[PDB]
């Protein structure tokens, strides 16, 4: 079917250079993967020993997400007030995506930050709750798509550039940015020509799956702020999810 244009290709080459220089351990991850001890998160609510081990790294994770959007020109052509709104809304969305795409079905464990390998349970009891299943259920699903950096990358942009976040200023400009990526993404998809029936439409559904994850994550954030010590919440963590 239809494919990219010398210009859109160039767009891709960008997004990618971004996601790749901002994705932990690159494709040399499985060798830094250090499985979390079996004992952290067990037989009960929350589980602070875990909640901690998680926020102990959640900081440098968000920064990456920030560093990723910074390498996107269409991003820097926005106001510093919106550049934030975006980060705040898509931060979780881009993070959890990045993790699902790293779900090893054999071991049945995600790999956060490219260093820590967690389990459905662990992640759940850890604070995300129902979101774990959701983030894992995603991973499993995606194992079929075999998304390459580019794809993950593009998918990550489509999220970043959500024109619907509230408080946004330069709406219209953004929407087209998103429109500008979506097209390219699809095209790039055609060149890829995956062996997966009725495709893209499906891939699009994943975007929703990721927005749901983020929308829920916020809810979970509040409980986390009630069932957990404000002594365990790194700033940026709060800076991002806090209203």
């Amino acid at each position: 079917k239809p494919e990219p244009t010398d210009e859109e290709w160039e767009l891709i080459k960008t997004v990618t250079e971004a996601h790749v220089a901002t994705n932990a351990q690159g494709s040399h991850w499985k060798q830094k993967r250090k499985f979390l001890p079996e004992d952290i998160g067990q037989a009960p609510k929350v589980d602070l020993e875990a909640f901690s081990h998680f926020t102990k790294i959640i900081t440098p994770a968000i920064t990456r997400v920030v560093d990723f959007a910074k390498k996107l020109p269409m991003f820097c052509e926005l106001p510093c007030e919106d550049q934030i709104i975006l980060l705040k809304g898509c931060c979780m969305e881009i993070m959890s995506l990045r993790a699902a795409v790293r779900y090893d079905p054999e071991s049945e464990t995600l790999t956060l930050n490219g260093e820590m390998a967690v389990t459905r349970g662990q992640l759940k009891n850890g604070g995300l709750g129902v979101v774990s299943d959701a983030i894992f259920d995603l991973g499993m699903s995606l194992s079929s798509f075999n998304l390459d950096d580019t794809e993950v990358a593009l998918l990550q942009a489509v999220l970043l550039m959500s024109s619907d976040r509230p408080g946004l200023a330069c709406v219209e400009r953004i929407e087209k940015y998103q429109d500008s990526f979506l097209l390219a993404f699809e095209h790039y998809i055609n060149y890829r020509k995956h062996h997966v029936t009725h495709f893209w439409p499906k891939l699009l559904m994943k975007v929703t799956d990721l927005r749901m994850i983020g929308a829920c994550h916020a809810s979970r954030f509040l409980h986390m702020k009630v069932e957990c010590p404000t002594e365990l919440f790194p700033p940026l963590f709060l800076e991002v999810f806090e209203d």
Binding site: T63, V66, D67, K70, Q83, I84, L87, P235, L236, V240
Partner: peptide
């Protein structure tokens, strides 16, 4: 605000 701003400003 705060930090984010900090991250959006670093050349580096």
């Amino acid at each position: 605000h705060k930090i984010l701003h900090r991250l959006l400003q670093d050349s580096s």
